[PDB]
Every structure is written in C-alpha cells, then in structure tokens.
C-alpha cells in the first residue's frame, strides 16, 4: 500500500493516485466479458461498469500500478466498429482537483467531505491503511460509496 511522505505538495493537502480508468468509444459491440479479459492481463479488476447509453464505462483496478499498465497499453485500441480509448478517471474526491492527464489529485484537506475522510482511513484498498489523514502524504484512491463505519 502507498502511504508516502510527500512534503513537496502544497500545504494542508494530500495526493491521491486514481485506480479508476475512464473507457471511451464503448459501442454495443464492446461487452463487459471481453473488456474484463483485456484488462485482467494487467492485474485484478475490482470493478467494471459499462453504460452503452453514454458510449462509456469505468474500470477500477485493485492496484494503481496495474491501472497505469492498463491505461498505457489500452490508450487507443481499434475494436469491431469503434476504438476503445482508456483515460484516467476520478473515483474519489472533487473532480476539479483531479489531473485528467495523469489520474493524480492534489486535494486540500478542507475540501474532503466527512464520507471522503472516513473512506480514506477505513478502505480495504488504497487510503491510509487505518491511519489519520495528515497533510503532505500520497496514497492510492480508497474504496468509496460504503456505509460510514469502523465495526464491519
């Protein structure tokens, strides 16, 4: 797990490495079983949700380094009637803080909601690994959209 001291980011901030990829060019010829097989070459797929209504999907890898390998390999892949285009997505924190070129957010701690703070510290994958949020640390995207809890 990434819990790095990053004392050269701005004051009162954290740095979050996305594990979430945006998938563009998802026509109805591009199906979840085939994409899962393509991305499982790079590591374990935590989540993969296509929405053919928007010609897009979102993939979350268990590991940042597998998301990096996937994004570079799958950046532009001709496929059937389309081209699959893999770009950095954001699954955590303010979208406005997410560098869409690199999948790296630098977030002022004051902009983290209570849910965001609780997900960071309690996530199974990414986050702090059970330590408090302090400024000048770099970590991986936490798991989100779960109950606020420390018992379960």
GROMACS .gro file of C-alpha atoms in nm:
model
  152
    1UNK     CA    1   0.000   0.000   0.000
    2UNK     CA    2   0.109   0.361  -0.084
    3UNK     CA    3   0.142   0.573   0.232
    4UNK     CA    4   0.428   0.801   0.119
    5UNK     CA    5   0.553   1.122   0.289
    6UNK     CA    6   0.520   1.380   0.005
    7UNK     CA    7   0.631   1.701   0.178
    8UNK     CA    8   0.670   1.892  -0.156
    9UNK     CA    9   0.293   1.904  -0.231
   10UNK     CA   10   0.122   2.227  -0.124
   11UNK     CA   11   0.039   2.287   0.244
   12UNK     CA   12  -0.264   2.120   0.411
   13UNK     CA   13  -0.314   1.880   0.113
   14UNK     CA   14  -0.296   1.511   0.022
   15UNK     CA   15  -0.206   1.347  -0.310
   16UNK     CA   16  -0.437   1.067  -0.435
   17UNK     CA   17  -0.341   0.829  -0.720
   18UNK     CA   18  -0.659   0.719  -0.907
   19UNK     CA   19  -0.722   0.346  -0.955
   20UNK     CA   20  -1.016   0.436  -1.185
   21UNK     CA   21  -0.998   0.437  -1.568
   22UNK     CA   22  -1.248   0.605  -1.799
   23UNK     CA   23  -1.336   0.390  -2.105
   24UNK     CA   24  -1.446   0.580  -2.417
   25UNK     CA   25  -1.575   0.457  -2.755
   26UNK     CA   26  -1.785   0.181  -2.589
   27UNK     CA   27  -2.031   0.089  -2.869
   28UNK     CA   28  -2.272  -0.203  -2.815
   29UNK     CA   29  -2.012  -0.435  -2.989
   30UNK     CA   30  -1.787  -0.383  -2.679
   31UNK     CA   31  -1.913  -0.612  -2.397
   32UNK     CA   32  -1.810  -0.643  -2.031
   33UNK     CA   33  -1.673  -1.006  -2.051
   34UNK     CA   34  -1.431  -0.908  -2.335
   35UNK     CA   35  -1.309  -0.585  -2.161
   36UNK     CA   36  -1.264  -0.776  -1.831
   37UNK     CA   37  -1.045  -1.030  -2.016
   38UNK     CA   38  -0.843  -0.747  -2.181
   39UNK     CA   39  -0.779  -0.561  -1.850
   40UNK     CA   40  -0.716  -0.884  -1.643
   41UNK     CA   41  -0.386  -0.909  -1.840
   42UNK     CA   42  -0.257  -0.609  -1.631
   43UNK     CA   43  -0.390  -0.712  -1.289
   44UNK     CA   44  -0.706  -0.788  -1.089
   45UNK     CA   45  -1.020  -0.588  -1.188
   46UNK     CA   46  -1.205  -0.460  -0.880
   47UNK     CA   47  -1.499  -0.307  -1.073
   48UNK     CA   48  -1.606  -0.267  -1.441
   49UNK     CA   49  -1.935  -0.093  -1.532
   50UNK     CA   50  -2.030  -0.010  -1.895
   51UNK     CA   51  -2.313   0.233  -1.977
   52UNK     CA   52  -2.374   0.184  -2.352
   53UNK     CA   53  -2.632   0.474  -2.332
   54UNK     CA   54  -2.332   0.714  -2.287
   55UNK     CA   55  -2.085   0.510  -2.501
   56UNK     CA   56  -1.859   0.489  -2.192
   57UNK     CA   57  -1.756   0.276  -1.894
   58UNK     CA   58  -1.549   0.293  -1.577
   59UNK     CA   59  -1.289   0.036  -1.461
   60UNK     CA   60  -1.132   0.021  -1.113
   61UNK     CA   61  -0.816  -0.190  -1.064
   62UNK     CA   62  -0.720  -0.318  -0.714
   63UNK     CA   63  -0.366  -0.170  -0.771
   64UNK     CA   64  -0.256   0.173  -0.905
   65UNK     CA   65   0.045   0.013  -1.090
   66UNK     CA   66  -0.197  -0.223  -1.280
   67UNK     CA   67  -0.419   0.080  -1.371
   68UNK     CA   68  -0.102   0.255  -1.506
   69UNK     CA   69  -0.005  -0.052  -1.716
   70UNK     CA   70  -0.369  -0.082  -1.847
   71UNK     CA   71  -0.405   0.289  -1.936
   72UNK     CA   72  -0.075   0.287  -2.141
   73UNK     CA   73  -0.148  -0.046  -2.324
   74UNK     CA   74  -0.525   0.022  -2.386
   75UNK     CA   75  -0.499   0.400  -2.457
   76UNK     CA   76  -0.617   0.351  -2.820
   77UNK     CA   77  -0.732   0.002  -2.932
   78UNK     CA   78  -0.923  -0.050  -3.258
   79UNK     CA   79  -1.211  -0.293  -3.186
   80UNK     CA   80  -1.505  -0.401  -3.412
   81UNK     CA   81  -1.688  -0.079  -3.524
   82UNK     CA   82  -1.502   0.151  -3.278
   83UNK     CA   83  -1.177   0.232  -3.093
   84UNK     CA   84  -1.153   0.164  -2.716
   85UNK     CA   85  -0.986   0.468  -2.553
   86UNK     CA   86  -0.862   0.429  -2.192
   87UNK     CA   87  -0.800   0.752  -1.999
   88UNK     CA   88  -0.755   0.842  -1.633
   89UNK     CA   89  -1.087   0.872  -1.445
   90UNK     CA   90  -1.171   1.002  -1.094
   91UNK     CA   91  -1.349   0.780  -0.839
   92UNK     CA   92  -1.259   0.984  -0.526
   93UNK     CA   93  -1.271   1.347  -0.414
   94UNK     CA   94  -1.350   1.671  -0.601
   95UNK     CA   95  -1.339   1.618  -0.981
   96UNK     CA   96  -1.192   1.973  -1.012
   97UNK     CA   97  -0.881   1.854  -0.810
   98UNK     CA   98  -0.817   1.554  -1.045
   99UNK     CA   99  -0.545   1.596  -1.314
  100UNK     CA  100  -0.721   1.410  -1.603
  101UNK     CA  101  -0.383   1.376  -1.786
  102UNK     CA  102  -0.224   1.163  -1.503
  103UNK     CA  103  -0.509   1.040  -1.273
  104UNK     CA  104  -0.344   1.225  -0.979
  105UNK     CA  105  -0.543   1.457  -0.747
  106UNK     CA  106  -0.388   1.709  -0.505
  107UNK     CA  107  -0.675   1.784  -0.261
  108UNK     CA  108  -0.681   2.048   0.011
  109UNK     CA  109  -0.784   1.853   0.326
  110UNK     CA  110  -1.052   2.124   0.391
  111UNK     CA  111  -1.232   2.007   0.066
  112UNK     CA  112  -1.267   1.641   0.188
  113UNK     CA  113  -1.629   1.564   0.296
  114UNK     CA  114  -1.688   1.352   0.612
  115UNK     CA  115  -1.765   1.048   0.383
  116UNK     CA  116  -1.435   1.113   0.189
  117UNK     CA  117  -1.232   1.135   0.518
  118UNK     CA  118  -1.397   0.815   0.653
  119UNK     CA  119  -1.349   0.619   0.327
  120UNK     CA  120  -0.977   0.726   0.315
  121UNK     CA  121  -0.898   0.588   0.660
  122UNK     CA  122  -1.122   0.271   0.650
  123UNK     CA  123  -1.073   0.143   0.290
  124UNK     CA  124  -0.960  -0.217   0.231
  125UNK     CA  125  -0.775  -0.099  -0.088
  126UNK     CA  126  -0.590   0.238  -0.103
  127UNK     CA  127  -0.642   0.514   0.157
  128UNK     CA  128  -0.421   0.545   0.472
  129UNK     CA  129  -0.449   0.178   0.590
  130UNK     CA  130  -0.620   0.287   0.914
  131UNK     CA  131  -0.407   0.598   0.996
  132UNK     CA  132  -0.545   0.952   1.033
  133UNK     CA  133  -0.538   1.198   0.740
  134UNK     CA  134  -0.242   1.439   0.779
  135UNK     CA  135  -0.102   1.690   0.528
  136UNK     CA  136   0.191   1.602   0.294
  137UNK     CA  137   0.105   1.235   0.227
  138UNK     CA  138   0.047   1.049  -0.103
  139UNK     CA  139  -0.185   0.747  -0.119
  140UNK     CA  140  -0.394   0.543  -0.369
  141UNK     CA  141  -0.771   0.600  -0.431
  142UNK     CA  142  -0.972   0.442  -0.148
  143UNK     CA  143  -1.280   0.222  -0.191
  144UNK     CA  144  -1.587   0.457  -0.172
  145UNK     CA  145  -1.972   0.453  -0.153
  146UNK     CA  146  -1.989   0.219   0.154
  147UNK     CA  147  -2.151   0.285   0.497
  148UNK     CA  148  -1.959   0.518   0.736
  149UNK     CA  149  -1.839   0.258   0.987
  150UNK     CA  150  -1.538   0.114   1.174
  151UNK     CA  151  -1.712  -0.204   1.315
  152UNK     CA  152  -1.766  -0.407   0.992
   0.00000   0.00000   0.00000
